[PDB]
């Protein structure tokens, strides 16, 4: 039973219970995201949503074991346990920055993680208009390990894991990897933190899908780290799983479909992000508080939506989609330039 209501700030929302999230919004925009930025804390918050949510397994439950609660705030509640798992490396820092907000505002940890993830995305130009539903009860048990994918897992292992967790198919796997468009890597190369996956880590766009399809020619920092392969630009990192998903015959044409197609990118990610945040939950038992999330902003300027970074042309693309040739994009002018690092807070 939802009660449409006008909050104290004058805005109308779907249920009166949503109004209290406007105070949470104001607090995290100022004190967690430094004035609404799509910087390191926003990226970490988006990563935390996946690591809290994908830890659920119908297959383990069928074996008599607890397979995890899905989107239940378990990675925050039992952080001493889940953040020690190898796939969750580096997440205790963002969990520690978020905890005080959960305590101050009296919301569940699962609902806060889903909220901060959606607000973080709304700070990145180009993001979809994000949803936010409430209702996740506090987890009562930590998830098991072995449920969050690693960059060195094969494509078959990853496809099978997301299919078990939420009945997601191989095309939906590609949809959710769009989040690597606003993201950096702090713990794979031990000599440098903050290496972005694409040349625009503050913009939700398809440069991740363009740049992962170019030929990898060098390591940005040290060579041969586990789960890392060569990348095409100085300062950019590329992980093994993204590299192989982009070239596998099952997923390569879906990976290429986002290039120069902003509306598909936004619509597909909007859809799959909402689905991840409902894992382990009953959708009809949740409350829609999407009207609290800020409107996303357009990408500023007048460059084409997708482009080759300076120094790269169609000859540097490793075409993997047999149905449709990679689109001929324009190249930015000038010499190749390094992607700038995104320094993380201490402890990342
Ligand atoms: C399906 C398989 C995936 C694998 C193997 C994977 C792998 C990784 C790795 C290795 C990192 C760097 C972690 C670190 O250095 O501590 C990373 C970062 C990131 N991942 Fe994924 N990822 C996956 C899917 C996703 C999904 C579905 C999302 C959606 C939210 C996501 C969002 C992020 C974000 C936003 C970052 C950047 C973190 C930051 O800047 O601090 N990833 N991913
Ligand atoms: Ca969880
Ligand atoms: Ca980007």
Swiss-Prot record:
Please list the residue ranges that the record marks as compositionally biased, kind Low complexity: 326-337
The active site of this protein is located at 51 (proton acceptor)
Q: How is the cofactor bound?
A: Binds 2 calcium ions per subunit. Binds 1 heme b (iron(II)-protoporphyrin IX) group per subunit.
The reaction(s) catalysed by this protein are:
1-(3,4-dimethoxyphenyl)-2-(2-methoxyphenoxy)propane-1,3-diol + H2O2 = 3,4-dimethoxybenzaldehyde + guaiacol + glycolaldehyde + H2O; 2 (3,4-dimethoxyphenyl)methanol + H2O2 = 2 (3,4-dimethoxyphenyl)methanol radical + 2 H2O
Q: Which cysteines are joined by disulfide bonds?
A: 7-19, 18-289, 38-124, 253-321
Q: Where is this region: Disordered?
A: 326-348
Query: Which cofactors, if any, are listed as required?
Result: Ca(2+); heme b
Q: What are the record keywords, sorted?
A: Calcium, Cleavage on pair of basic residues, Disulfide bond, Glycoprotein, Heme, Hydrogen peroxide, Iron, Lignin degradation, Metal-binding, Oxidoreductase, Peroxidase, Signal, Zymogen
Respond yes or no to whether keyword Iron is given for this record. yes
Show the Pfam families listed in the entry: peroxidase (PF00141), Peroxidase_ext (PF11895)
Which GO terms of type biological process are on file? cellular response to oxidative stress; hydrogen peroxide catabolic process; lignin catabolic process; response to reactive oxygen species
Name the glycosylated positions: 261
Q: Which residues bind heme b?
A: 180
Read off the PROSITE patterns from this record.
Answer: PEROXIDASE_1, PEROXIDASE_2, PEROXIDASE_4
Would you tell me the protein name for this molecule? Ligninase H8
Lineage of producing organism = Eukaryota, Fungi, Dikarya, Basidiomycota, Agaricomycotina
Query: What gene codes for this chain?
Result: LPOA
């Amino acid at each position: 039973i939802e009660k449409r209501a006008t909050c104290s700030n004058g805005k109308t929302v779907g249920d009166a219970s949503c109004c209290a999230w406007f105070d949470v919004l104001d607090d995290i925009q100022q004190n967690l995201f430094h004035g609404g930025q799509c910087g390191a804390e926003a990226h970490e918050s988006i990563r935390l949503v996946f690591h809290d949510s994908i830890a659920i397994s119908p297959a383990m439950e069928a074996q008599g074991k607890f397979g995890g609660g899905g989107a239940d705030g378990s990675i925050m509640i039992f952080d001493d346990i889940e953040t020690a798992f190898h796939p969750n490396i580096g997440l205790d820092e963002i969990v520690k920055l978020q905890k005080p907000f959960v305590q101050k505002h009296g919301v569940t940890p699962g609902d806060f993680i889903a909220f901060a993830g959606a607000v973080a995305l709304s700070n990145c130009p180009g993001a979809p208009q994000m949803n936010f539903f409430t209702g996740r009860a506090p987890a009562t048990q930590p998830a098991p390990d072995g449920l969050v994918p690693e960059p060195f897992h094969t494509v078959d292992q990853i496809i099978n894991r997301v299919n078990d967790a939420g009945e997601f198919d191989e095309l939906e796997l590609v949809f959710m990897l769009s989040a690597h468009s606003v993201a950096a890597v702090n713990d794979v190369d031990p000599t440098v933190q903050g290496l972005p996956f694409d040349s625009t880590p503050g913009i939700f766009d398809s440069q991740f899908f363009v740049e992962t399809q170019l030929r990898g020619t060098a390591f940005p920092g040290s060579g041969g780290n586990q789960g890392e392969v060569e990348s095409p630009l100085p300062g950019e990192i590329r992980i093994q799983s993204d590299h192989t998903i982009a070239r596998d015959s099952r997923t390569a044409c879906e990976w290429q479909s986002f290039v120069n197609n902003q509306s598909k990118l936004v619509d597909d990610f909007q859809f799959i992000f909402l689905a991840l945040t409902q894992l382990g939950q009953d959708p009809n038992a949740m409350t829609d508080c999407s009207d609290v999330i800020p409107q996303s902003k357009p990408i500023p300027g007048n460059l084409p939506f997708s482009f080759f970074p300076a120094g790269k042309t169609i000859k540097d693309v490793e075409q993997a989609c047999a149905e449709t040739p990679f689109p001929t994009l324009t190249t930015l002018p000038g010499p190749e330039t390094s992607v700038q690092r995104i320094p993380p807070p201490p402890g990342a």
